[PDB]
Write an enzyme that holds these catalytic residues in place. Structure first.
Site, PDB file in Angstrom:
ATOM      1  N   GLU A 156       0.784  -1.222   0.000  1.00 44.76           N
ATOM      2  CA  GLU A 156       0.000   0.000   0.000  1.00 44.76           C
ATOM      3  C   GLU A 156       0.813   1.269   0.000  1.00 44.76           C
ATOM      4  OE1 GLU A 156      -3.073   0.223  -0.412  1.00 44.76           O
ATOM      5  OE2 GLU A 156      -3.690  -1.789   0.091  1.00 44.76           O
TER       6      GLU A 156
ATOM      7  N   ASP B  70      -6.351   6.572  -5.025  1.00 43.02           N
ATOM      8  CA  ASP B  70      -5.864   5.231  -5.127  1.00 43.02           C
ATOM      9  C   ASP B  70      -5.925   4.775  -6.595  1.00 43.02           C
ATOM     10  OD1 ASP B  70      -8.499   4.417  -5.549  1.00 43.02           O
ATOM     11  OD2 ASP B  70      -8.636   3.167  -3.776  1.00 43.02           O
TER      12      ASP B  70
ATOM     13  N   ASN C  55      -7.292 -20.207 -10.122  1.00 40.64           N
ATOM     14  CA  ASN C  55      -8.585 -19.553 -10.099  1.00 40.64           C
ATOM     15  C   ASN C  55      -8.510 -18.129  -9.596  1.00 40.64           C
ATOM     16  OD1 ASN C  55     -11.333 -19.199  -8.294  1.00 40.64           O
ATOM     17  ND2 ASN C  55     -11.580 -20.438 -10.160  1.00 40.64           N
TER      18      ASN C  55
END
Ligand code: CL
Ligand code: CL
Length: 162
Positions: free
Chosen positions: A11, A20, A132
């Protein structure tokens, strides 16, 4: 390595309001302020979070405090979701950090939505889950991060974070 260091890497740290990757108003260490396009709305939410008239700027201490609160909330959110808890409980410590990272980024709701991956994780089918998990907007939009987290689930090690 631990969740805190891990997320601080993912972050970053910014002391002035910024946008962001999704263009939302954020501050500190990935602390989302609002989804509204209004910078005032953002400043309003910030002052309220911090408890003072900040004028869009905060100190390092303040950011860290937001961060602690936010990690805490993510864990607790997990433990309180019926779809997530069982998964999280079945995992080893490294991998729990991977789950938390995901929740920190996209919310409980968002993560609770990866049903098929969740099942795979619960069954400890790491390579399959990894595949996945990559079939997602998440991966397509923030590939380097997603890759780091996925590798963490895959391997149960911190190697992606070196
Ligand atoms: Cl808050
Ligand atoms: Cl990325």
């Amino acid at each position: 390595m631990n969740i805190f260091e891990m997320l601080r890497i993912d972050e970053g740290l910014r002391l002035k309001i910024y946008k962001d990757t999704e263009g939302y108003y954020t501050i500190g260490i990935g602390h989302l302020l609002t989804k509204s396009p209004s910078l005032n709305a953002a400043k309003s939410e910030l002052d309220k979070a911090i408890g003072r008239n900040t004028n869009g700027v905060i100190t390092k201490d303040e950011a860290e405090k937001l961060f602690n609160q936010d990690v805490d909330a993510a864990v607790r959110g997990i433990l309180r979701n019926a779809k997530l808890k069982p998964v999280y409980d079945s995992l080893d410590a490294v991998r729990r950090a991977a789950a938390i990272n995901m929740v920190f980024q996209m919310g409980v709701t968002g993560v609770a939505g990866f049903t098929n991956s969740l099942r795979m994780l619960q069954q400890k089918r790491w390579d399959e889950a990894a595949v996945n998990l990559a079939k997602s907007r998440w991966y397509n939009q923030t590939p380097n991060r997603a890759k780091r987290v996925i590798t963490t689930f895959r391997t149960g090690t911190w190697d992606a974070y070196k």
